[PDB]
Design an enzyme around this catalytic site. Structure first.
Site, PDB file in Angstrom:
ATOM      1  N   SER B  32      -0.291   0.563  20.578  1.00  0.00           N
ATOM      2  CA  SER B  32       0.715   0.910  19.573  1.00  0.00           C
ATOM      3  C   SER B  32       1.076   2.390  19.492  1.00  0.00           C
ATOM      4  CB  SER B  32       0.284   0.404  18.198  1.00  0.00           C
ATOM      5  OG  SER B  32       0.252  -1.014  18.186  1.00  0.00           O
ATOM      6  N   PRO B  38      -0.253   6.671  15.696  1.00  0.00           N
ATOM      7  CA  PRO B  38      -1.356   7.372  16.368  1.00  0.00           C
ATOM      8  C   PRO B  38      -2.692   6.629  16.283  1.00  0.00           C
ATOM      9  CG  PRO B  38      -0.922   8.387  14.251  1.00  0.00           C
ATOM     10  CD  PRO B  38       0.152   7.358  14.452  1.00  0.00           C
ATOM     11  N   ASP B  39      -3.580   6.919  17.234  1.00  0.00           N
ATOM     12  CA  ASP B  39      -4.946   6.405  17.243  1.00  0.00           C
ATOM     13  C   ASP B  39      -5.731   7.079  16.115  1.00  0.00           C
ATOM     14  OD1 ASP B  39      -7.590   5.503  17.916  1.00  0.00           O
ATOM     15  OD2 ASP B  39      -7.094   5.515  20.045  1.00  0.00           O
ATOM     16  N   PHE B  40      -6.140   6.282  15.123  1.00  0.00           N
ATOM     17  CA  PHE B  40      -6.836   6.783  13.921  1.00  0.00           C
ATOM     18  C   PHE B  40      -8.236   7.340  14.198  1.00  0.00           C
ATOM     19  CE2 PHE B  40      -4.283   3.046  12.123  1.00  0.00           C
ATOM     20  CZ  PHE B  40      -3.163   3.820  11.831  1.00  0.00           C
ATOM     21  N   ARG B  41      -8.815   6.962  15.338  1.00  0.00           N
ATOM     22  CA  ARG B  41     -10.097   7.495  15.805  1.00  0.00           C
ATOM     23  C   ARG B  41      -9.964   8.969  16.201  1.00  0.00           C
ATOM     24  NH1 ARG B  41     -10.391  10.223  19.817  1.00  0.00           N
ATOM     25  NH2 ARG B  41      -8.142  10.079  19.394  1.00  0.00           N
ATOM     26  N   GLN B 103      -7.293  -5.369  16.751  1.00  0.00           N
ATOM     27  CA  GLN B 103      -7.927  -4.402  15.860  1.00  0.00           C
ATOM     28  C   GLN B 103      -6.900  -3.677  15.000  1.00  0.00           C
ATOM     29  OE1 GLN B 103     -10.425  -2.966  19.493  1.00  0.00           O
ATOM     30  NE2 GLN B 103     -11.381  -2.055  17.682  1.00  0.00           N
ATOM     31  N   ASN B 104      -5.623  -3.833  15.347  1.00  0.00           N
ATOM     32  CA  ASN B 104      -4.542  -3.091  14.697  1.00  0.00           C
ATOM     33  C   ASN B 104      -4.048  -3.758  13.428  1.00  0.00           C
ATOM     34  OD1 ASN B 104      -4.785  -1.485  16.990  1.00  0.00           O
ATOM     35  ND2 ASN B 104      -2.864  -2.203  17.913  1.00  0.00           N
ATOM     36  N   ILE B 105      -3.487  -2.944  12.534  1.00  0.00           N
ATOM     37  CA  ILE B 105      -3.040  -3.392  11.216  1.00  0.00           C
ATOM     38  C   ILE B 105      -1.522  -3.233  11.040  1.00  0.00           C
ATOM     39  CG2 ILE B 105      -5.268  -3.151  10.073  1.00  0.00           C
ATOM     40  CD1 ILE B 105      -2.545  -0.405   9.924  1.00  0.00           C
ATOM     41  N   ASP B 106      -0.838  -2.976  12.152  1.00  0.00           N
ATOM     42  CA  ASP B 106       0.556  -2.527  12.132  1.00  0.00           C
ATOM     43  C   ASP B 106       1.620  -3.634  12.180  1.00  0.00           C
ATOM     44  OD1 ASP B 106       0.623  -3.253  14.878  1.00  0.00           O
ATOM     45  OD2 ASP B 106       0.043  -1.228  15.486  1.00  0.00           O
ATOM     46  N   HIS B 123      -8.996  -6.909  11.797  1.00  0.00           N
ATOM     47  CA  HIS B 123      -9.108  -5.847  10.803  1.00  0.00           C
ATOM     48  C   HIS B 123      -8.054  -5.936   9.704  1.00  0.00           C
ATOM     49  CE1 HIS B 123     -11.425  -3.440  14.104  1.00  0.00           C
ATOM     50  NE2 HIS B 123     -12.183  -4.363  13.538  1.00  0.00           N
ATOM     51  N   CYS B 131      -4.743  -6.286  -5.447  1.00  0.00           N
ATOM     52  CA  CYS B 131      -5.688  -5.750  -6.413  1.00  0.00           C
ATOM     53  C   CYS B 131      -7.127  -6.067  -5.982  1.00  0.00           C
ATOM     54  CB  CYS B 131      -5.395  -6.380  -7.758  1.00  0.00           C
ATOM     55  SG  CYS B 131      -6.636  -6.095  -9.022  1.00  0.00           S
TER      56      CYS B 131
HETATM   57 ZN    ZN Z   1      -5.510  -6.732 -10.951  1.00  0.00          ZN
END
Ligand code: ZN
Lengths: 7, 277
Positions: B32, B38-41, B103-106, B123, B131
């Site tokens: 990605s 960017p690579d968060f690592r 592993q990505n959240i994008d 992930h 909440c």
């Molecule tokens: Zn709540």
């Protein structure tokens, strides 16, 4: 359940 | 021994054979980066105890501001999947995709046309938010979360006043049940593992490639060579590394498969569609 590790 | 030779050409020949019916993709941040993520690592003002605290649940729950500040800085102007994402779409459409573990959240796998059943979002995802209070769990959409991020107001539940977080798995949080459920079935019978854009440093994701049968070939497409791969020793028999960027690796593999035109057309029409939104 197993947790996210290694960061 | 299922690969004739330990090369990209060897992997391509294998993929073309009748033996190779089911492929699992295992992907990380490297798929990605060309999508402007960017690579968060600018986070100096928060005086973090150490840089890694930014993605740890215990730290986040008490001090969420650094995370949301970073989210603002790195939020993309558009969500446009890469060549590598579209290579996986080709695998899907050709009936070859058993699963994509990400592993990505994008959300870029989803946008590329991989369906819910195709994916293990190991992930979680930035797409939906909740909440943190178990007795409440009020849901919030991306538009709500994005507004909080850009206005620099810490997301807070409108009912119970608790923290609202994106549905990402922070370090120290449990992975979704789906991860373990799919892992128990998918790796019992699989013909190829395609490991792309990950150095396999994050557990238990890193452990996945060891779960495959011992005969299952494994191709790494990554910028550099913790999953237990053996490319180089005299005992090497099934693992192949292609070193460089994921887009370029996927283009090279597609060309060997005779899919170069198909892939480039797909990328261009899908990008056009996204740009025309
Ligand atoms: Zn709540």
């Amino acid at each position: 359940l197993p947790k996210k590790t290694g960061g | 021994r299922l690969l004739d030779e330990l090369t990209l050409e060897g992997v391509a020949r294998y993929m073309q054979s009748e033996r190779c019916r089911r492929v699992i993709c295992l992907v990380g941040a490297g798929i990605s980066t060309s999508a402007g993520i960017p690579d968060f690592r600018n986070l100096e003002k928060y005086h973090l105890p150490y840089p890694e605290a930014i993605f740890e649940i215990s730290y986040f729950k008490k001090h969420p501001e650094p995370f949301f500040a970073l989210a603002k800085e790195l939020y993309p102007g558009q969500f446009k999947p890469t060549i590598c994402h579209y290579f996986m779409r080709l695998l899907k459409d050709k009936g070859l995709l058993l699963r994509c573990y990400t592993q990505n959240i994008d959300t870029l796998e989803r946008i590329a046309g991989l369906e819910q059943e195709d994916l293990v979002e190991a992930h979680g995802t930035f797409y939906t938010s909740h909440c943190v209070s178990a007795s409440c769990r009020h849901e919030y959409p991306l538009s709500w979360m994005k507004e909080k991020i850009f206005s620099e107001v810490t997301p807070k539940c409108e009912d119970c006043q608790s923290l609202v977080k994106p549905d990402i798995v922070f370090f120290g949080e449990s992975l979704p049940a789906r991860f373990f459920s799919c892992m128990q079935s998918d790796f019992l019978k699989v013909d190829l593992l395609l490991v792309m854009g990950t150095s396999l440093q994050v557990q238990p994701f890193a452990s996945l490639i060891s779960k495959a049968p011992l005969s299952t070939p494994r191709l790494l497409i990554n910028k550099e060579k913790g999953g237990g791969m053996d490319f180089d020793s005299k005992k090497a028999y099934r693992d192949v590394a292609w070193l460089g960027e994921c887009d370029q690796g996927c283009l090279a593999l597609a060309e060997l498969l005779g899919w170069k035109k198909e892939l480039e057309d797909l990328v261009r029409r899908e990008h056009a569609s996204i740009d025309a939104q």
